Structure formats: structure tokens, C-alpha cells
Amino acid sequence: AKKVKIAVDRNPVETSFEKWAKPGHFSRTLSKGPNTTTWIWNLHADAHDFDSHTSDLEEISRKVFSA
Amino acid sequence: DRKLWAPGVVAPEYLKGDLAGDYGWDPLGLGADPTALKWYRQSELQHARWAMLGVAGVLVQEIVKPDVYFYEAGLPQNLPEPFTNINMGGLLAWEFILMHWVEVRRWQDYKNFGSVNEDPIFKGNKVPNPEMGYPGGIFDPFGFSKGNLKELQTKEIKNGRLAMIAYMAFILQAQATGKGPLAALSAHLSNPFGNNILKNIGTCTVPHSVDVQGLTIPLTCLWPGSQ
Amino acid sequence: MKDFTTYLSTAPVIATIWFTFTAGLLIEINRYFPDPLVFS
Amino acid sequence: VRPVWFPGNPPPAHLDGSLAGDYGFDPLFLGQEPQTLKWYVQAELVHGRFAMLGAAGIILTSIGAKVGLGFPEWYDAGKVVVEKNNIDFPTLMVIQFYLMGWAETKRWYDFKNPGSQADGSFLGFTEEFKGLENGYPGGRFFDPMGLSRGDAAKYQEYKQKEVKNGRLAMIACLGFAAQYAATGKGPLDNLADHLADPNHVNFATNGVSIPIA
Amino acid sequence: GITSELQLYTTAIGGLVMAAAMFFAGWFHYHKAAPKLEWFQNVESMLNHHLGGLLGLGSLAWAGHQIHVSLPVNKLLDAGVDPKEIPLPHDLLLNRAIMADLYPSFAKGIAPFFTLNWSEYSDFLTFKGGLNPVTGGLWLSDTAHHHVAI
Amino acid sequence: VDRSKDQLYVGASQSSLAYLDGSLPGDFGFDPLGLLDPVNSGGFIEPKWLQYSEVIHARWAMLGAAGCIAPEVLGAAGLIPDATNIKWFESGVIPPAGSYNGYWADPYTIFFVEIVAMQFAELRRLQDFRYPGSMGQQYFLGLEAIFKGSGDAAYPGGPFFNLFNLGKTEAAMKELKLKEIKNGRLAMLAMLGYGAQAVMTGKGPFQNLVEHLADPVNNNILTNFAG
Numbered sequence: 001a002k003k004v005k006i007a008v009d010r011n012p013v014e015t016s017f018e019k020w021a022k023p024g025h026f027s028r029t030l031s032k033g034p035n036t037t038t039w040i041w042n043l044h045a046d047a048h049d050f051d052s053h054t055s056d057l058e059e060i061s062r063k064v065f066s067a
Numbered sequence: 068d069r070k071l072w073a074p075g076v077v078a079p080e081y082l083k084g085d086l087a088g089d090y091g092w093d094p095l096g097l098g099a100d101p102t103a104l105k106w107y108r109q110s111e112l113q114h115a116r117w118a119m120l121g122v123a124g125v126l127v128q129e130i131v132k133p134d135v136y137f138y139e140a141g142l143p144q145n146l147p148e149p150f151t152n153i154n155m156g157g158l159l160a161w162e163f164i165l166m167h168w169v170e171v172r173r174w175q176d177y178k179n180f181g182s183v184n185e186d187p188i189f190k191g192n193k194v195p196n197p198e199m200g201y202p203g204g205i206f207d208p209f210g211f212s213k214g215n216l217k218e219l220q221t222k223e224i225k226n227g228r229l230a231m232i233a234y235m236a237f238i239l240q241a242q243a244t245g246k247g248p249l250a251a252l253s254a255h256l257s258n259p260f261g262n263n264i265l266k267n268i269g270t271c272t273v274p275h276s277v278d279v280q281g282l283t284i285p286l287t288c289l290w291p292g293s294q
Numbered sequence: 295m296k297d298f299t300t301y302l303s304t305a306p307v308i309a310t311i312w313f314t315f316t317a318g319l320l321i322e323i324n325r326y327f328p329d330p331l332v333f334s
Numbered sequence: 335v336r337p338v339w340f341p342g343n344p345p346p347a348h349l350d351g352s353l354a355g356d357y358g359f360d361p362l363f364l365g366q367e368p369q370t371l372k373w374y375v376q377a378e379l380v381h382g383r384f385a386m387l388g389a390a391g392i393i394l395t396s397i398g399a400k401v402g403l404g405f406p407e408w409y410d411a412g413k414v415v416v417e418k419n420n421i422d423f424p425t426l427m428v429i430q431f432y433l434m435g436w437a438e439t440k441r442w443y444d445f446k447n448p449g450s451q452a453d454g455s456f457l458g459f460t461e462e463f464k465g466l467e468n469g470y471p472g473g474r475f476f477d478p479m480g481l482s483r484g485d486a487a488k489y490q491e492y493k494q495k496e497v498k499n500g501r502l503a504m505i506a507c508l509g510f511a512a513q514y515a516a517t518g519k520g521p522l523d524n525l526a527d528h529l530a531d532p533n534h535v536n537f538a539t540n541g542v543s544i545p546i547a
Numbered sequence: 548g549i550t551s552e553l554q555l556y557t558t559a560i561g562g563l564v565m566a567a568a569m570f571f572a573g574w575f576h577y578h579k580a581a582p583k584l585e586w587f588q589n590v591e592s593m594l595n596h597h598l599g600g601l602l603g604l605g606s607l608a609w610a611g612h613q614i615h616v617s618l619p620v621n622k623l624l625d626a627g628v629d630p631k632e633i634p635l636p637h638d639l640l641l642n643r644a645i646m647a648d649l650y651p652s653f654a655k656g657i658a659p660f661f662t663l664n665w666s667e668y669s670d671f672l673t674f675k676g677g678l679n680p681v682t683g684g685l686w687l688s689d690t691a692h693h694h695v696a697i
Numbered sequence: 698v699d700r701s702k703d704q705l706y707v708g709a710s711q712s713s714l715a716y717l718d719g720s721l722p723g724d725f726g727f728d729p730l731g732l733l734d735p736v737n738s739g740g741f742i743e744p745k746w747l748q749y750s751e752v753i754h755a756r757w758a759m760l761g762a763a764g765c766i767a768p769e770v771l772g773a774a775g776l777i778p779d780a781t782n783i784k785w786f787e788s789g790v791i792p793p794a795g796s797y798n799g800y801w802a803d804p805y806t807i808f809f810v811e812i813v814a815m816q817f818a819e820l821r822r823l824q825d826f827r828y829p830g831s832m833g834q835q836y837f838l839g840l841e842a843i844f845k846g847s848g849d850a851a852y853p854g855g856p857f858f859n860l861f862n863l864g865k866t867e868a869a870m871k872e873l874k875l876k877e878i879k880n881g882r883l884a885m886l887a888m889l890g891y892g893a894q895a896v897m898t899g900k901g902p903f904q905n906l907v908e909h910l911a912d913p914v915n916n917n918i919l920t921n922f923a924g
């Protein structure tokens with residue numbers, strides 16, 4: 001009988017432009033940077049595929065809610 | 068062990084009875100800075116001493132000349148016959164020159180205690196000036212300073228504080244009722260209930276502005292009373 | 295601020311500013327010199 | 335320790351109080367990079383110094399207008415001066431950019447390479463253009479009275495005074511523009527109106543600043 | 548019931564404030580206070596709020612606008628009144644006398660609602676069906692009873 | 698919500714007793730929605746902000762409840778001129794409902810002074826919540842001496858906000874806080890009553906009370922649905 005209640009985590013992530021300057025940060029494969037033009041398309045194709053960036057359901061849900 | 072302004076209230080640390088008339092009253096904590104407390108103490112003496120002259124002048128002037136209505140006594144046409152309609156510009160010139168000298172001397176004493184005791188023109192003359200704000204000497208010809216000076220300082224400040232409250236009562240009463248202090252007192256006695264603050268508070272009897280020898284001077288009441 | 299200016303240096307941001315500038319220049323020229331067909 | 339624009343908020347790391355007029359006000363972190371902060375420190379001083387000249391000039395001429403000496407309002411002086419004196423505006427504009435361009439280019443390459451303008455290239459002057467600090471030329475031309483070469487403690491006090499009067503002047507010059515747009519009258523014309531009836535004559539009643547009024 | 552470009556302008560400004568609020572909420576609920584996984588899995592609670600709270604109160608609130616703003620304004624517009632001469636929506640809200648002229652049921656206040664004399668509101672809660680002959684669209688009185696029922 | 702006093706109110710639940718241990722003032726166990734649960738709290742929904750907000754709402758509501766009816770009571774007793782016997786919603790706060798001409802300035806001119814004054818009062822109060830004790834450090838004309846706080850945001854204390862240092866003992870202070878919260882909660886309901894009664898009847902709170910006493914059966918919420 002888990003009670004229905006508000007549950008959050010405080011300051012889960014930091015607000016910084018650091019990752020805005022590192023394309024592909026969300027994915028392990030693309031984080032290394034481009035070697036072929038195929039990398040550029042892969043960046044946009046997998047940007048919103050949250051379920052493949054992380055295997056954590058909680059992290060996926062939080063991105064969906066804010067998106 | 069001295070009595071305080073209210074029962075069962077802790078006095079501030081910096082108020083330990085050194086100064087006269089010390090009830091440990093400082094809700095805004097303006098005396099926390101030791102240097103600021105000295106300056107505010109001087110201004111309390113200035114307001115206390117000027118206010119006492121103000122209250123005495125209004126009351127005595129009312130008795131001798133009931134019709135002058137001190138609030139309007141500043142107008143040149145209301146001045147005594149020798150000075151009636153004197154040029155206010157020249158009259159102000161005397162006050163500025165004379166008060167600028169006297170007040171700068173008092174100010175320099177505060178900045179550097181004991182520097183301005185000696186007379187500038189006639190060498191040799193000096194005042195004791197035992198404490199700041201209490202020059203003594205020529206300012207105390209009768210020598211009342213000798214004796215229990217601490218008690219006299221207490222009497223001065225307590226009467227001076229009462230004068231400050233009393234004088235601003237004269238101003239607000241004149242603005243609201245248009246009568247001097249004694250005149251308003253007589254009015255209350257005649258009709259205590261019909262004539263009191265509950266009725267007069269809503270009216271301000273001061274004109275918006277006056278013309279003093281061709282110069283327009285703005286005037287105001289201390290509250291937005293119904294003109 | 296260093297990272298933010300790095301973000302503005304990314305290819306999509308530069309292209310947007312560059313073509314916004316390039317387009318604006320061409321649009322403004324045709325506003326003051328309408329209908330250019332021959333150098334003359 | 336030192337006072338800040340928002341009491342209780344710690345000052346930013348990149349603002350350590352060394353600069354004049356530092357109150358730790360940089361909410362957008364525009365000057366986080368040390369080299370960019372030098373550029374803005376000088377930009378603020380140049381903006382502040384021009385505003386002080388502008389505000390003093392606008393105020394003085396406005397007093398001339400009210401007293402009746404015949405001065406035009408600051409927003410009409412340009413047209414009056416050109417027409418009355420028969421001056422060709424494009425020639426006057428060009429002359430300004432030659433004189434400003436030469437003087438302001440020298441200030442530009444002293445920022446890039448400090449001390450470069452004091453090499454004697456310009457008419458043999460070798461010490462009047464060396465520069466003392468960033469934004470503070472010094473020297474016997476820009477500082478003839480040597481108030482920057484006397485007491486060190488008081489010179490730091492003046493730097494505080496210069497920036498704060500400069501910031502105040504910058505705000506005032508914005509007030510002149512905003513007041514003219516809202517009211518259409520001169521600076522001191524607005525001041526006279528406010529003193530007449532302060533309660534019923536101000537921005538909340540001009541019918542523009544608060545449209546919902 | 549929009550009759551002036553001022554009313555359109557105010558909605559646009561409100562739209563931008565809502566847009567700013569939406570972007571703040573996204574930042575807030577990801578970088579500041581992010582709900583946990585157990586929060587997202589209250590499907591029973593979410594349906595209750597989204598059925599009675601989002602759709603339910605949303606329909607009731609819009610019925611309030613139609614009953615108090617759309618119906619009076621469109622009744623006068625169809626009658627041929629010049630748009631600039633129509634009463635403003637807040638005048639209709641504050642003055643029950645004006646509403647009574649258009650719809651006499653308003654003269655009785657909300658007592659019929661609580662006394663279950665719902666037939667008193669037949670003049671503005673209709674079930675006509677068909678299309679309004681003057682404008683060729685559905686009766687707004689029908690549309691109001693629709694959103695009240697919904 | 699059980700009226701009056703009691704150990705627990707009607708809505709008290711075993712779930713809410715987990716964290717409601719009587720430490721807070723007016724802690725009667727009433728939290729059916731469990732908004733004060735410490736576990737996994739964040740944002741504004743946390744015990745410290747919610748308890749702080751209730752006190753702030755209580756104090757504003759108490760001033761509002763007494764201030765939204767005093768003009769009518771004083772006007773009814775003849776202690777103020779009839780020109781100022783005005784319903785709370787016809788003072789000027791809602792011009793469409795009614796506005797009063799006769800203030801010293803246009804109501805928008807007065808509002809700007811309200812904005813500036815409340816910016817200082819409210820942002821300084823906030824900074825003591827974010828950084829406890831921070832308002833007693835930076836110079837503020839010597840007034841920082843009285844803004845040092847007491848560690849608990851809702852109860853600053855100090856020489857001014859605790860002018861007469863009441864509740865010196867721990868037991869006494871708890872009773873005062875409880876009395877403050879109950880009066881504050883009662884005033885919050887009274888203010889909601891003023892707002893609801895204004896819409897339903899269109900009259901002032903004092904008028905509604907007088908009418909109810911006249912014919913209690915013929916004057917109540919049920920009869921006001923229609924007129």
C-alpha cells in the first residue's frame with residue numbers, strides 16, 4: 001500500500017553551458033567526436049532517443065517530463 | 068539597576084548608564100556604532116536645547132502678545148514696529164553669517180575635541196569644556212556646573228526631551244486647529260467633548276503658499292489634512 | 295561564458311548568424327537599389 | 335565584507351573588489367573571462383565619461399533656456415546650431431570622425447599593446463601617451479595637474495568617485511531620453527512641473543509609462 | 548466574444564507569459580526538483596486529476612466563459628448591434644441587470660441551480676440542435692449546455 | 698478541520714502522525730494531503746517553507762481582517778466622517794467595484810511607493826531565509842543591528858520585532874506562538890469570508906452581520922442565492 005505522495009530529488013543536475021559546447025555528450029558512442037560525416041546525422045537522429053542513452057527508467061522519465 | 072523605559076526589558080550592551088537620562092531605549096539600534104552614538108548624542112542636545120527655547124518663546128510670546136499667532140509671526144508685516152517690513156534678504160544675511168561661525172566652531176570641537184577652546188582674537192581666554200557638548204566657562208557664568216554635574220545633565224535632558232515632544236504638539240495643533248498652544252487649551256476647557264482632536268484632526272488650516280515680499284514660499288501640513 | 299561563446303561557435307549557430315547576415319545584406323541592397331538587371 | 339548590490343548574496347568569483355566601483359554586480363557573468371573584463375572596464379569608463387560631459391552640457395543649456403538666455407533644448411540644439419551658423423552637416427560629421435578616429439585608434443592600440451603609443455612615433459612625444467593603468471591614461475597631457483601622481487591613497491578615492499558619478503550620469507542621460515519621449519518637454523521643464531504639484535505630476539500620471547493607469 | 552484588437556493583444560501578452568512559465572517549469576523540474584520514478588507511476592492518481600481536473604474543470608471553466616461572455620456578446624452581434632456599442636464582458640459580469648434583459652433567467656440568480664429548478668435556465672441552456680440561421684453555426688446556448696454536461 | 702481546540706482534528710490520519718510530532722505551533726495533526734512529509738521533499742513543498750508561509754499568511758490576514766471592517770465599525774459609531782465609511786472592496790483596490798477620490802495622490806502614484814517600500818521589506822526578509830543572519834552584516838544606516846534574526850526565519854525577534862521581549866521563558870513563548878497561529882488561522886478564514894460574502898451579497902462584512910442578527914432565518918447564505 002505505497003502511499004501516493006510528492007517525491008522529488010533536489011538539484012539533480014547542474015545548470016551549465018559546458019555540455020552545450022560538447023556535442024554528443026548524451027551518448028557514449030558520439031561523445032568522442034566526429035571522424036566521418038555520418039557522426040553529424042547520428043547526433044540529430046539519437047538526440048531524443050532517451051531510452052537508448054541510459055538504462056535508468058527514472059532518468060528517462062525526468063527527461064520526458066521536461067521535454 | 069537603573070529603571071528602564073519598559074518593565075522587564077533588557078537594555079542594549081552599549082547603553083550602560085554612562086550618559087545622562089539613559090533608560091536603555093534604542094529599538095532601532097542606532098547607537099551600535101560607538102562613533103555614531105557620539106554624534107547622535109550631540110544632535111539630541113541641540114534639539115533638546117533649541118526646542119526648550121522654542122517652547123519658552125511660544126508660550127511667553129503668547130502671554131505678552133496674544134494676537135501675533137506665532138505660526139504667522141515669521142511674516143515681515145507681523146514684526147515689531149522697529150523691524151516691521153524689514154527686508155528679509157538682509158535679515159537672513161545676519162543669521163547666515165553669524166550662525167555659520169558659531170556652528171562651525173561647535174562642529175570643529177566635535178571633530179577634534181579641545182581644539183577650539185581658546186579665543187581666536189584675544190589670546191588667553193579659554194573655556195574648560197569638561198565634556199563634549201558642555202562648554203562651560205563663559206557659557207556658565209553662574210557656575211552651576213560645579214557640584215553634582217551628573218544630576219544637572221539628567222535634569223537638562225529630561226526637560227529637553229519633554230520640550231521636543233511639547234513643541235511638535237504646538238505645531239500640529241496650530242496646523243489642525245489654527246490656534247496657539249494656550250488658545251487651544253482654553254478652547255478644550257470650554258467644550259471638552261465638542262472641541263478635541265477627534266474633530267479637528269481632519270482639517271489643515273495652513274494655506275498652500277504665501278508671498279513674502281514678492282517671493283513665493285511653499286507651505287505644508289505634516290499630514291494630508293483636508294485643506 | 296567561455297563555454298557559452300563556444301556554443302555560439304558551433305556550426306549550426308555560425309551558419310544561422312552568417313546566413314542571417316548574408317541574407318540581410320542582399321535584402322537591404324535590393325531595398326535601396328530595387329530591380330537590378332544590368333550593371334550599367 | 336565589502337558591500338554588494340544585493341545584500342546577502344556572495345559576490346562573483348571574478349569580481350574581487352580590486353576595480354573601482356566594484357559591488358559584485360554581474361548577474362549574467364558577462365565579464366567572467368579576465369581578458370574580456372579589461373575590455374569592459376574601459377568601455378564603462380568611456381561610456382561614463384561621455385555621459386558626464388553629456389549630462390553636464392544638457393543641464394547647463396537647459397538652465398539657459400529656462401532663464402531666458404535663448405538656448406535651445408538639447409533635442410533641438412543640433413538643428414539650431416547648423417542653421418544659425420550656416421554649417422554643412424556632412425562636413426562637420428566627417429571632421430569629427432577624423433579627429434575621433436585618430437584619437438580613439440590610439441587608445442585602441444594602447445589597449446592591445448600597452449605602451450606602444452609612447453615610442454616617439456607621434457611627433458616625438460614619448461611619455462605623454464605611455465598610460466598608467468587600463469582606462470587611466472595619466473601623463474602630463476591627460477592629467478596636467480598630476481592628481482594621479484601625488485598621493486596614492488587619494489588617487490584611489492578619486493577612481494571611486496569617477497566611476498560612480500559616471501554611472502549616475504549614464505542613468506541620467508537615459509532619463510533625459512525617456513522623459514523627452516514620454517513628455518516632449520525639456521529636462522528642467524519636467525523638474526519645474528514636478529515641484530509645482532509632485533503628487534499629481536509624475537510618471538504615473540503622464541498617461542504613457544503606465545498605460546493601464 | 549472578442550470584439551477589439553486590444554483583447555487580442557492582451558491574450559498574446561498572456562501567451563508569452565505562459566510560454567515563459569512553461570520553459571521555467573521544464574528547467575525547474577529537471578535541474579532543481581525532479582520527480583522520482585515512484586511519482587511517475589501513480590497512474591490511478593494521474594487519471595483522476597486528468598479526468599476531473601484537466602478535462603472536467605477545463606470544460607466547466609469554459610462553460611463559465613460562454614455563459615457570461617460568449618452568449619451575451621453573440622446574442623447582440625447577431626441582432627445587428629454595432630460591435631463597438633456592445634457592453635464589455637466585465638460590465639455583463641458585474642451588472643446582473645444587463646444580463647437579465649438578454650436572458651431573464653439571470654434575474655433569479657443561482658437559487659434555481661441549488662433548488663434543482665434547472666428548467667429555469669432553459670433560455671440560455673438549450674437543446675435546439677441544428678444551425679443558427681443568422682450565422683450558420685451551432686447555437687452557443689446549445690454549446691454551453693454541452694460543456695456543462697461534459 | 699475540527700473547530701475549537703483538541704488533541705487531534707477530524708482529518709488527522711495515522712500517516713500524518715509519522716512526522717507531525719507537535720514541534721511546530723498549532724500542530725493538531727491535520728495534514729490529509731501529507732504536504733509536510735520530510736521524506737523526498739524539495740522545491741517550495743518542504744516543512745521549512747510551508748510553515749514559514751503559513752505564519753506570513755497569518756500575519757497579513759490578521760491585519761486584513763481587522764482593516765477590512767474597522768472603517769465600517771468606526772463609521773457606524775460616528776468616530777470617522779461618513780465620507781470615509783467605505784466598504785473594503787470600494788476603497789480603490791478594485792476600481793470597477795468602486796474607487797475613492799480624496800487620497801493625496803492618484804492610486805497608481807501611491808502604488809509605486811508601495812512597490813519600492815515592499816521591495817526593500819520583502820527582499821530583505823527573503824535574504825534572511827536564504828542566508829540566515831546575512832542582513833545584520835552589510836551597512837544599512839545602522840539598522841542592521843536589529844536585522845540579525847534568531848535562526849528561525851518566521852520569528853526574527855531582536856530589539857525591534859520583539860520590542861517588549863515577551864515570552865521570555867520557553868514555555869511562555871510556545872503559548873504565544875500557538876495563540877498567534879490560531880488567531881492567524883481564524884483571520885485567514887475571515888478574509889475568505891469577506892471575499893465570498895462580498896460577491897454573494899455585494900455589501901460590507903459589517904452590514905452582513907447586522908442583517909443576519911435582524912432576521913437570522915431570512916438572512917443567511919441560503920436565502921442570498923436569490924434576491
Ligand code: CHL
Binds near residue numbers: 433436443456
Ligand atoms: C600605407 C598607408 C597607411 C595607412 C593605411 C595608415 C593608416 C593609419 N595610420 Mg598611418 N598609415 C599609413 C602609412 C603610414 N602611417 C605612418 C605613421 C602613423 C602614425 C605615427 C600613426 C598612424 C596612424 C594611422 C591610423 C589613423 C586612423 C585615423 O582615423 O586617421 C585619421 C586621419 C587623420 C586625422 C589625418 C588625415 C586627415 C585628412 C585625410 C587630410 C587633411 C589634410 C589637410 C591639410 C587638413 C588641414 C586642416 C587644417 C587647416 C584645419 C590609420 C590606421 C595613427 C594611429 O592610429 O596609430 C595607432 C598614428 O598614431 N600612422 C607612416 C609613417 C611611418 C606611414 C608611412 O607610410
Ligand code: CLA
Binds near residue numbers: 269270
Ligand atoms: C488606520 C487609521 C486611519 C486611516 C488610514 C485613515 C484615513 C483617512 N482618514 Mg481617518 N480617522 C481615523 C483613522 C484613520 N483614518 C481615526 C481613528 C479617526 C478618529 C480620530 C479618524 C478621523 C478622521 C477625520 C476627522 C478625517 C479623516 C480623514 C481621513 C483621510 C485622510 C485625511 C485626513 O485629514 O486624515 C486625518 C486622520 C488622521 C490623522 C487619523 C490618523 C490615525 C492613525 C493613522 C492611527 C492611530 C491613531 C491613534 C489610535 C490615536 C487616535 C486619536 C487619539 C486622541 C486617541 C483618509 C481617508 C479625513 C476625511 O474624511 O477626508 C475625506 C477627515 O476629515 N479621518
Ligand code: CLA
Binds near residue numbers: 017063064572578
Ligand atoms: C539556460 C538554461 C539551461 C542550461 C544552461 C541548461 C543546461 C543543461 N541542460 Mg537543461 N533545460 C533548460 C535550461 C537549461 N539547461 C530548460 C529551459 C529546460 C526545459 C525544456 C531544460 C531541460 C533539460 C533536459 C530535459 C535536459 C537538459 C540537459 C541539460 C544539459 C545539456 C543541454 C544541452 O546540451 O543543450 C544543448 C541543446 C540545445 C541548444 C537545443 C535547444 C532546444 C530548445 C528546446 C529549442 C527548440 C527549438 C525548436 C527546435 C525550434 C524549431 C526548429 C525549426 C525552425 C528548424 C546541461 C547540464 C540534459 C542533461 O542534463 O543530460 C544529461 C537533458 O537531458 N535540460
Ligand code: CLA
Binds near residue numbers: 608612655
Ligand atoms: C467555473 C465557471 C463559472 C464561474 C467562475 C462563474 C462565476 C459567476 N457566475 Mg456563473 N455559472 C456557471 C459557471 C460559472 N460561473 C454555470 C455552469 C452556470 C449554469 C448553471 C452558471 C450560472 C450562473 C447564474 C445564473 C449566475 C451566475 C453568476 C455568476 C457570478 C456570481 C456568482 C455568485 O453569486 O457567487 C457567490 C460567491 C462566490 C462564487 C464566492 C466568491 C469567493 C471569492 C472569490 C473569494 C476571495 C477571497 C480572497 C482572500 C479575498 C480577496 C483579498 C485580497 C483583495 C487582498 C460569477 C461571476 C451570477 C451573476 O452575477 O451573473 C451575472 C448569476 O446570477 N452564474
Ligand code: CLA
Binds near residue numbers: 569571575582
Ligand atoms: C503539468 C504540470 C505540472 C505538474 C504535474 C507539476 C508537478 C509538480 N510540481 Mg510543478 N510547475 C508547473 C507545472 C507542473 N508541476 C508549472 C507550469 C510551474 C511554473 C509556474 C511549476 C512550478 C513549480 C514549483 C515552483 C514547484 C512545483 C512543484 C511541483 C510538485 C508539487 C505540485 C503540487 O502539489 O501542486 C499543488 C498546487 C499548489 C500548492 C498551488 C496551487 C495554486 C497555483 C499557484 C495555481 C493553480 C491554478 C489553477 C490550475 C487554475 C486556476 C483557475 C482560476 C481560478 C484562475 C510536483 C512534482 C513543487 C515541488 O517541487 O515540490 C516537491 C514546487 O516547489 N512546480
Ligand code: CLA
Binds near residue numbers: 760767771797
Ligand atoms: C494590511 C493593512 C492595511 C492596509 C493595506 C490598509 C489600507 C487602507 N486603509 Mg486600513 N486599516 C488597517 C489595515 C490596513 N488598511 C487596520 C489594521 C486598521 C485598524 C486599526 C485599519 C483602519 C482603517 C481606517 C479607519 C481607515 C483605513 C483606511 C485605509 C485606506 C487608506 C490608507 C491611508 O490613507 O493610510 C494613511 C497612511 C498612513 C497612516 C501612513 C503614514 C506614513 C507616513 C510617511 C508616516 C510618517 C510618520 C512620522 C514621520 C512620525 C510618526 C508620527 C506619529 C507619532 C504621529 C486604505 C485602503 C481609510 C479608508 O478606507 O479611507 C477611505 C480609513 O478611513 N483603514
Ligand SMILES: CC(/C=C/C=C(C)/C=C/[C@@]12O[C@]1(C)C[C@@H](O)CC2(C)C)=C\C=C\C=C(C)\C=C\C=C(C)\C=C\[C@@]12O[C@]1(C)C[C@@H](O)CC2(C)C
Binds near residue numbers: 140
Ligand atoms: C528643535 C525643535 C524646535 C525648535 C523650535 C524653534 C527654534 C522655534 C522657534 C519659533 O517658535 C518661536 C520661538 C516663535 C515663532 O514665532 C517663530 C519660530 C521660529 C517658529 C524641535 C525638535 C523636535 C524633535 C523631536 C520631536 C524628536 C523626536 C525624536 C524621537 C521620538 C526619536 C525616537 C527614536 O530615535 C530614538 C531616540 C531611538 C530609536 O532607537 C527609536 C526612535 C523611535 C526612532
